[PDB]
């Protein structure tokens, strides 16, 4: 502590009195993790790999609840031509726990994928499918000219 006060005052010699120093706080002993103890894996397979998808005017919306996700499985796949999360880091998804997940599935042409970012404007973004300005979530787009 004495050398620490010498450090705080930036002087070799210290005068008589009281000197406030860097505060003490007791460190955590260990770590506790608590999550709901559900176990079923989530069916992302039919969500992201359907036989067929709905059109933009009637864009399909699947509810995801009461399941254990695994976004690392998707994130490691190279089939994702475009993958951008606008309210969370894509890697951190494994350590974040959600109240629900809406999967909005549809098909467009290649040039309109820039229109699907949140806050964007354009014919698709104006007259059939608009994301909120404060949108949080992820956007996935991949070519299907072979399907």
């Amino acid at each position: 502590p004495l050398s620490e006060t010498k450090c705080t005052l930036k002087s070799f010699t210290v005068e008589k009195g009281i000197y406030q120093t860097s505060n003490f706080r007791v460190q955590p002993t260990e770590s506790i993790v608590r999550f709901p103890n559900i176990t079923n894996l989530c069916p992302f397979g039919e969500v992201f790999n359907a036989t067929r998808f709905a059109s933009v005017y009637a864009w399909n919306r699947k509810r995801i609840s009461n399941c254990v996700a695994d976004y690392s499985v998707l994130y490691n796949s190279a089939s994702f031509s475009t993958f951008k999360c606008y309210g969370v880091s894509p890697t951190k998804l494994n350590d974040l726990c959600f109240t629900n997940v809406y999967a909005d599935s549809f098909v467009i042409r290649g040039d309109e994928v820039r229109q699907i970012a949140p806050g964007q404007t354009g014919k698709i973004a104006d007259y059939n499918y608009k994301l909120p300005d404060d949108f949080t979530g992820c956007v996935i787009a991949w070519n299907s000219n072979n399907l």
């Binding site: 004495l2 010699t13 008589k16 009195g17 009281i18 406030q20 860097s22 505060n23 007791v26 460190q27």
Partner: protein, 117 residues
């Protein structure tokens, strides 16, 4: 949130000694673990607590003051307010000074600080 608080170092001038005391402020120091003293201002470690009272030299808090005294060490104590004195009051008694002393006292006051632009 885990117990936390500011920490202060009680010390005389390093030109006199190297011994120091540590005051964990606002901490009931049963958590910190012969010189452990639970003040009303937290806990003091490294000083000997005595029942003797002196004038406050190094302010600790809540009536506790520290000092460096003999064998030399840091002592914490309840600061004495002053010399005890009972005035010999009576309804027909008077005190008159028969002698006087003229004393000079220095009073120092700042008048100005350095101009800066």
């Amino acid at each position: 949130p885990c117990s936390f608080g500011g920490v202060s170092v009680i010390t005389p001038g390093t030109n006199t000694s190297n011994q120091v005391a540590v005051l964990y402020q606002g901490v009931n120091c049963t958590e910190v673990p012969s010189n452990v003293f639970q003040t009303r201002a937290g806990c003091l470690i490294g000083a000997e607590h005595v029942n003797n009272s002196y004038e406050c030299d190094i302010p600790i808090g809540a009536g506790i003051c520290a000092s460096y005294q003999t064998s030399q060490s840091i002592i914490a104590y309840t600061m004495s307010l002053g010399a005890e004195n009972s005035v010999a009051y009576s309804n027909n008694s008077i005190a008159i000074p028969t002698n006087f002393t003229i004393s000079v006292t220095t009073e120092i006051l700042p008048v100005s600080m350095t101009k800066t632009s």
